[PDB]
């Protein structure tokens, strides 16, 4: 289908700081991925982002009813919706499943990579550290980074580039809001 | 620090339209235009909260009218196709004959139109598959997830085939047990 496409994207954003102490509302409009007009609660009125949005900014600013509804959104819309879902969104804590297994950089040599699999956790905030005999190994670490699964869970693989020598005890330390102190998984050669 | 986004869209000539709520990059719920129902991302959300789907259908009607105005005002300037980047992953480390889920992550694309097909040994998989709606991004491109639960074996290979108007040929991303 070579037919030209035309896209209209309204985005009503609610930004929260210290719970509901400081709340910022943005009513943004995008035509073909380009922002044309926006209402920002820190401004208090509509502003054109491009010349395409100028008629809308002037028109919406001329209507006191539209302006008053937008100025009230931080309380009637943002703060309201935050409270509605707080128990299953803000309060959501899902423990990570931590697994440690040896792997290989390429299938032509022995185990030269130690993988720490950290999966099925919520929220995304996580810290993964590798330790060798009680000492932190900073160098030789490759990770997938934070992966969002799209079902309210996150995953990550933190790999240590090492040649394991017999007697060595490696520890993967995980820090997440779902658990009070850190989580640890040991692996021996 | 949290972010709640009510993301909507209307697309022509497809007459495609969606309405959803996003919380920190994750979907709370969306409203299906085919029906008139609030579809919750997880079952539990619908037991703790509620939404009147009528509000979403009314907003989509306004977006459609606004798109018409905008198409005329821009002197019929079309969208530039941004092709997606596709990643195939499993929700947890793969264990032989222990059930898992194959995730096809379709990212950084516009317009929100895509044909996604799971392939087991080159054959299409029509059953057991689930998908998300078109999810928003900070750069105003779209995200989408496609899911395929499976029994891991050394005899079954998988490929996620993605088609988009910004792509010359379909994009195929592979997964096999190793």
């Amino acid at each position: 289908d070579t037919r030209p496409r035309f896209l209209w994207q309204p985005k009503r954003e609610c930004h929260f700081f210290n719970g509901t102490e400081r709340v910022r509302f943005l009513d943004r409009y995008f035509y073909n991925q380009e922002e044309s007009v926006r209402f920002d609660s820190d401004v208090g009125e509509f502003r054109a982002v491009t010349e395409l949005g100028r008629p809308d900014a002037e028109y919406w600013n001329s209507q006191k009813d539209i302006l008053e509804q937008a100025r009230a959104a931080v309380d009637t819309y943002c703060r309201h919706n935050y409270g509605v879902g707080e128990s299953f969104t803000v309060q959501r804590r899902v423990q990570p499943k931590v697994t440690v297994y040896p792997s290989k950089t390429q299938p032509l040599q022995h185990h030269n990579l130690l993988v720490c699999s950290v999966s099925g956790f919520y929220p995304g905030s996580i810290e993964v550290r590798w330790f060798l005999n009680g000492q932190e190994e900073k160098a030789g670490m490759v990770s997938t980074g934070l992966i969002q699964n799209g079902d309210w869970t996150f995953q990550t693989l933190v790999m240590l580039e090492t040649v394991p020598r017999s007697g060595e005890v490696y520890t993967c330390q995980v820090e997440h809001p779902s658990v009070t102190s850190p989580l640890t998984v040991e692996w021996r050669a | 620090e949290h972010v709640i986004i009510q993301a909507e869209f209307y697309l022509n000539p497809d007459q495609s339209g969606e309405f959803m709520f996003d919380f920190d990059g994750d979907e709370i719920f969306h409203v299906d235009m085919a029906k008139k129902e609030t579809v919750w991302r997880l079952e539990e959300f619908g037991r703790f909260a509620s939404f009147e789907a009528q509000g979403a259908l009314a907003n989509i009607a306004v977006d459609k009218a606004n798109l018409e105005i905008m198409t005329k005002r821009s002197n019929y300037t079309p969208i530039t196709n941004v092709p997606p980047e596709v990643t195939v992953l499993t929700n947890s480390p793969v264990e032989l004959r222990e059930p898992n889920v194959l995730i096809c992550f379709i990212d950084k694309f516009t317009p929100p139109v895509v044909n996604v097909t799971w392939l087991r040994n080159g054959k299409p998989v029509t059953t057991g598959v689930s998908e998300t709606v078109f999810l928003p991004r900070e750069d105003h491109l779209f995200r989408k997830f496609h899911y395929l639960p499976f029994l891991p074996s050394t005899e079954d290979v998988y490929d996620c085939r993605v088609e988009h108007w910004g792509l010359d040929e379909p994009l195929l991303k592979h997964w096999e047990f190793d």
Partner: peptide, 13 residues
């Protein structure tokens, strides 16, 4: 327990 919709406004004119 009801999620509130930010009502869409029509552009000019």
């Amino acid at each position: 327990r009801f999620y509130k919709t930010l009502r869409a406004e029509q552009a000019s004119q």
